[PDB]
Amino acid sequence: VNSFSGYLKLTDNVYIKNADIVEEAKKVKPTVVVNAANVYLKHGGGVAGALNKATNNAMQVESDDYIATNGPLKVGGSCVLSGHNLAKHCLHVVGPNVNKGEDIQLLKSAYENFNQHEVLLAPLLSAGIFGADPIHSLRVCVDTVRTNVYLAVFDKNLYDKLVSSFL
Numbered sequence: 608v609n610s611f612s613g614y615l616k617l618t619d620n621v622y623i624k625n626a627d628i629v630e631e632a633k634k635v636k637p638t639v640v641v642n643a644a645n646v647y648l649k650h651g652g653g654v655a656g657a658l659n660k661a662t663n664n665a666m667q668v669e670s671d672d673y674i675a676t677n678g679p680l681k682v683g684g685s686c687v688l689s690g691h692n693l694a695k696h697c698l699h700v701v702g703p704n705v706n707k708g709e710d711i712q713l714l715k716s717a718y719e720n721f722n723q724h725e726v727l728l729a730p731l732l733s734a735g736i737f738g739a740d741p742i743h744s745l746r747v748c749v750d751t752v753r754t755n756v757y758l759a760v761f762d763k764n765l766y767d768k769l770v771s772s773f774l
Contacts, residue, residue: 609637609726611757617773620755621748625766628654628730628759629661632693637757640690641721641729643737644699646679648686653735662691670699682709683716698724702733702744711739718751726755741765742772749773 611631614622624631632640643654648670650659659666669688680686685700702717703709717732731748733739748756760766 609635611635611637611728614757615770617745618749620753621758622756623758623760623766623769625761625763626759627761628728629657629693631728631757631759632658633661635728635757637690637694637726637728639696639698639724639727640694641727641732642697642699643730643732643735644680644701645704646682646684646701648674648680648699654730658693658697661693665689665691666697683713685717685720694728696724698727700732702737702739704737705733706736706738711743714739714744714747715751718748721748721752721756722754724754726757728757728759730759742769745769745773 614624616622642658650656650667673688680701682701682703685698688697690697700717700720703711703713705711714733721727731741731744734741734744
């Protein structure tokens with residue numbers, strides 16, 4: 608259905624809302640939800656942990672089998688698995704972990720994966736424990752993505768910072 612409510616347009620194809628991505632997914636039932644994954648699809652903290660926990664670990668069991676069969680992802684890469692109760696599909700995208708010396712230029716490759724899907728609900732990539740500046744992350748998203756992305760940012764203080772840096 609993709610019934611997003613209450614978003615602000617930052618550009619013709621990029622929208623933002625002050626919301627929890629899990630709560631949004633449950634209420635919007637999007638075609639694609641994006642996960643901020645690592646290369647072994649171990650969903651231990653941050654957004655990955657929260658999305659997995661909302662599937663009652665169905666996402667981790669499916670991920671372990673994917674890795675066993677196909678091997679790990681590369682930084683900047685992605686795979687499409689089941690969305691379980693959150694969406695039709697989950698796009699697991701690996702942004703660079705700046706804290707661990709992964710190259711920030713790969714954030715652009717990470718966001719390019721979004722262009723394979725017409726509508727996505729997504730978090731900001733490489734924010735949080737991955738260590739990237741979230742405003743920088745949004746800037747790359749807006750420069751790189753050409754499809755329709757609905758971004759959910761939970762922290763109100765961060766949300767207000769982003770909105771005023773863009774508008």
